[PDB]
Nucleic acid binder design. Structure first.
Lengths: 67, 185, 60, 260, 144
RNA sequence: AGGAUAGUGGCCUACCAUGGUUUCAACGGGUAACGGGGAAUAAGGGUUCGAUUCCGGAGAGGGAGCCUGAGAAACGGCUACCACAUCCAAGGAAGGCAGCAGGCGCGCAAAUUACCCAAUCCUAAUUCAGGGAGGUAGUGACAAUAAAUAACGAUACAGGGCCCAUUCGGGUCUUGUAAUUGGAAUGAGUACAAUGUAAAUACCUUAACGAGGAACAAUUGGAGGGCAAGUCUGGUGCCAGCAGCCGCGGUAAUUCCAGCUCCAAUAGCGUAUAUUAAAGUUGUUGCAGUUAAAAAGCUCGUAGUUGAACUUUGGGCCCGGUUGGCC
RNA sequence: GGACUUUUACUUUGAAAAAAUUAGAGUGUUCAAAGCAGGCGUAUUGCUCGAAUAUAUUAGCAUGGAAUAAUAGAAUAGGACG
């Protein structure tokens, strides 16, 4: 078989130059807590509709609901 | 978008499918070498077509034209390497003299039954795909190999072949497994 | 000229055909092995050679 | 076309690029620089496609911002810096130096050069005029701007520069009978000598170039870079040294290297 | 000699002379005139979905004497009314009125075939299933 | 001359002149026209295609106008109208998928409402963020690459072995043979595991398993001719029907429908449409013009095409590149 | 400087004429369509080949040529050499 193998000066210096999945492949890293591509774009498009801190409006949109 | 790719058709039919004097001769040749279908000899003839077509426009110049020099010498080395043109016979008109059975000879299926180990050309052709012949360090799965004048010495069973040893094979695996239950109770 | 036509006579032969079910004959090879036998059939175990190789001769 | 084009599809790059089609669909486009996009090659092709150190541009950008690479004495982190002709590349790690020198094929050759001479830079004048405040100024192959250059330097002339200070050190005046390095076209990569020149008024002076091994060819004056005087070139030459031998020898040479 | 000019500069005469004469060629004619696109049962499309109007009993031309079980067909795409032939034996029983039938060329470049007059079409599919498959009774004609 | 333009430019403006193109095909019309590199065929020369994986252009429903920005008259920017079309709480308000998908209409006809930027490139303030670009997977008989569907046995001897092939009951070390009988050889499949990958999935390697009918069965079209293959049997009755052409089809039909046999190709094979070769049936290569289609009624006659011959040759001489059995 | 160039058509060679595509080298991707890769060493912390060549006209540019086919100089010599 034909394949490649790497050996760095140190594990951290390996970590700093190694792709994450290969690091996950050996347990050096792990699946990052993250959602799917479509879901993450949705919120970013949601965040494309939001400007500012938004609590005054968040309490405003809630407040229009009370009465 | 995607970068283009080049692919080619490898065979071509004559001006008529049905001319018995040509249909019969290939039928003679197909069974002689245990050939699979007409499309393969259609491929070798097309391969002959372009080299023979390239023969003319190679030789329509003078002998001292360097393009003729390179192209002719580039031609003969390939023909010598594949060995369909033997080590002798190194003339361009001798190249014009090439015949189809010669390429039908360099075929692995032809070469294997030439020196044995298969007892049948028809058994031979499947046998390579059946993973029981080794040409290099890798399993070969083609009867149509066009041996390049070297691997004929290496001809033998595949390492993974029970013909090459080390396995009882499916037939003796299953039957010895059912020997274990049918020999007694 | 004459134009009156009848179209109910369709498929007269098939309707009147006394059907025979397909004869179950054992399988034969295909590709490699059948090519072997057919060439052998046509050049080894010759059947009719009377004057020439008649190749679908009438049985007699 | 709504402005300058920015994405270049693969296979539209100059032939010397030699990029495989299977990699994808685009090409690494060098940005605007001291050289044109049609004769240069970036810093990514060197590391992955020339020196084979790399496999992707992401790692190349990692090293470049880590500043180990510096072309012509400046790191210039640009991923596709338009490395032009005969420039100097200093790699601090591995302490390696290369030059943008072309073989007879006219494609990039990786030649190792010494820091004792990689420090400086040569160039070919493009135009010399008088700028603001009466100051003469030259334009060279990389479009260098050299204030107060020699009065005798003229258009299409050789200049040697510190590469650290924009000053004229010594100039090789363009005249008949010296080694040259044709820079464009098929005759790119032919290290011949000047025979003589055809003035050819109205534009495009032509000059005949005789190769060291008795091969003659003419070219436009634009295509040439003087590399000093005959037999004594100011710059280390690549393997072969601009010869253009026939295809028979290349076959024989490969049978001499590995074929034996 | 030979009635055509033989000068170096005469090509313009020859080019217009030949291009004009090419009009008489039939194949070169209909393409440039666009007969298929302008007036044809189909604009050169190999297949055309058609609607059965009714079954017609057409007498074969001399020297033959037969009834050739054709159908009048209207095309959905252009409303053109033509007639189409059905090969094989029977096969009008295999079809019904108001069932879509696919039509393709007759293999004769128009030019109604032999004994069957004024017809230039053969049907291959009926109600979305093949006639041959129905003739082989591999499948059954659907109920829609 | 001036304006305006980033600037040249009746581009526009004022005045002036009456000019400019054209049978060397201008202008006008059509073009089922995006151009090209290129695609098929292709002895050669061509012919045809070229919407499209690369270049250039144009458009983003039909127009017009414009902001910002260097670069946009941008449209996954805007304004307004036109047409479609949406919600509405009827007051208002919101749109331009010919971007990826996906859905309808439409046709003869066109793939999943997946994953990831891993690879290729790309941007930003820029290692780090992102990229339905792209790539991966999915569908996929569009096309191309190589090619599973069995070999050893013997089964009567239905054949040169031989003792001059006796007297073929004798291994006739090879050729064929009654769905008989056993031993090897196999994937296709299955899937640990590993290789695989952005993760995968498929691929591979690989355990165990996994074929006797190895039913884990190959079809496609044909057998008067072109054109290879039936006067073989039955039904058939100029009907049904076949037949690309001739034609055949009436109880002998070798052509139809059946069967069996045998063909050709073969995991691809038929059909249609268009197209090129064949086609020297368009012609430069390379047609014919008396009668098969055609020499104009004749003459003139411009544009067009073709166009008499003849001007430093020879004589030598020197220099200087080759071939070979005289290296 | 080019105080000076009858004009050409033509033709030789070169230049540039994209890339891809084609032809076509090498090239055990098992072969092949391919693809432009590799081969080798105590393999212990390494030696080292590639990545071809051609074809890509018409028009434009230099080029040697002066046959071919044009075109033209002096006749009311307002001619030429100075």
């Amino acid at each position: 078989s034909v394949g490649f193998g790497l050996v760095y000066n140190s594990v951290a210096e390996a970590k700093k130059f190694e792709p994450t999945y290969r690091l996950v492949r050996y347990g050096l890293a792990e699946k990052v807590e993250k959602a799917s591509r479509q879901q993450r774009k949705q919120k970013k498009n949601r965040d494309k509709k939001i400007f500012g801190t938004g609590k005054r409006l968040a309490k405003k949109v809630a407040r229009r609901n009370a009465d | 978008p995607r970068a283009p790719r080049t692919y080619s058709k490898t065979y071509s039919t004559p001006k008529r499918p049905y001319e018995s004097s040509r249909l019969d001769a290939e039928l003679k040749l197909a069974g002689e070498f245990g050939l699979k279908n007409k499309k393969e000899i259609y491929r070798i003839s097309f391969q002959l077509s372009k080299i023979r077509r390239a023969a003319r426009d190679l030789l329509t110049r003078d002998e001292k034209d360097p393009k003729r020099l390179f192209e002719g010498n580039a031609l003969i080395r390939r023909l010598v390497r594949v060995g369909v043109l033997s080590e002798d016979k190194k003339k361009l008109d001798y190249v014009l003299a090439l015949k189809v059975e010669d390429f039908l000879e360099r075929r692995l299926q032809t070469q294997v039954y030439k020196l044995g180990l298969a007892k049948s050309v028809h058994h031979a052709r499947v046998l390579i795909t059946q993973r029981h012949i080794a040409v290099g360090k890798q399993i070969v799965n083609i009867p149509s190999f066009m041996v390049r004048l070297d691997s004929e010495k290496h001809i033998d069973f595949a390492p993974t072949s029970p013909f090459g040893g080390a396995r009882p094979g499916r037939v003796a695996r299953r039957n010895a497994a059912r020997k274990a239950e049918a020999s007694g109770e | 000229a004459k134009v009156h036509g009848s179209l109910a006579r369709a498929g007269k032969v098939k309707s009147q055909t006394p059907k025979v079910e397909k004869t179950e004959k054992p399988k034969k090879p295909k590709g490699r092995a059948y090519k072997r036998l057919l060439y052998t059939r046509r050049f080894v175990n010759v059947t009719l050679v009377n004057g020439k190789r008649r190749m679908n001769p009438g049985p007699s | 076309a709504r402005g300058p084009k920015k994405h270049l599809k693969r296979l539209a790059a100059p032939h010397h690029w030699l990029l495989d089609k299977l990699s994808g669909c685009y090409a690494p486009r060098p940005s605007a620089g001291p050289h044109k996009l049609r004769e240069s090659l970036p810093l990514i092709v060197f590391l992955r496609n020339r020196l084979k150190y790399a496999l992707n541009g992401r790692e190349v950008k990692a090293i470049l911002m880590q500043r180990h690479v510096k072309v012509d004495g400046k790191v210039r982190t640009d991923t596709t810096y338009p490395a032009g002709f005969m420039d100097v590349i200093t790699l601090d790690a591995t302490n390696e130096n290369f030059r943008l020198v072309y073989d007879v094929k006219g494609r990039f050759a990786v030649h190792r050069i010494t820091d004792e001479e990689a420090s400086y830079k040569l160039g070919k004048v493009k135009k010399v005029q008088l700028g603001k405040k009466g100051v003469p100024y030259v334009v060279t192959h990389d479009g260098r701007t050299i204030r107060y250059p020699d009065p005798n330097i003229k258009v299409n002339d050789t200049v040697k520069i510190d590469l650290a200070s924009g000053k004229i050190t010594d100039f090789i005046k363009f005249d008949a009978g010296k080694l040259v390095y044709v820079t464009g076209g098929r005759n790119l990569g032919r290290i011949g000598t000047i025979v003589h020149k055809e003035r050819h008024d109205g534009g495009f002076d032509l000059v005949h170039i005789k190769d060291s091994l008795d091969n003659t060819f003419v070219t436009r004056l634009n295509n040439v870079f003087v590399i000093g005087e005959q037999g004594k070139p100011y710059i280390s030459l690549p393997k072969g040294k601009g010869i253009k031998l026939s295809i028979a020898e290349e076959r024989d040479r490969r049978r001499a290297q590995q074929g034996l | 000699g030979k009635g055509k000019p033989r000068g170096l500069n005469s090509a313009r005469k020859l080019r217009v002379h030949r291009r004009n004469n090419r009009w008489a060629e039939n194949n070169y004619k209909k393409r440039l005139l666009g007969t298929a696109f302008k007036s044809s049962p189909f604009g050169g499309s190999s297949h055309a979905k058609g609607i059965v109007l009714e079954k017609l009993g057409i007498e074969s031309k001399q020297p033959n004497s037969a009834i050739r079980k054709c159908v009048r067909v209207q095309l959905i795409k252009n409303g053109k009314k033509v007639t189409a032939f059905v090969p094989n034996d029977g096969c009008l029983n295999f079809v019904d009125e108001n069932d879509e039938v696919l039509l393709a060329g007759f293999g004769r470049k128009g030019k109604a075939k032999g004994d069957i007059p004024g017809v230039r079409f053969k049907v291959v599919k009926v109600s979305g299933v093949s006639l041959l498959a129905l003739w082989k009774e591999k499948k059954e004609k659907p109920r829609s």
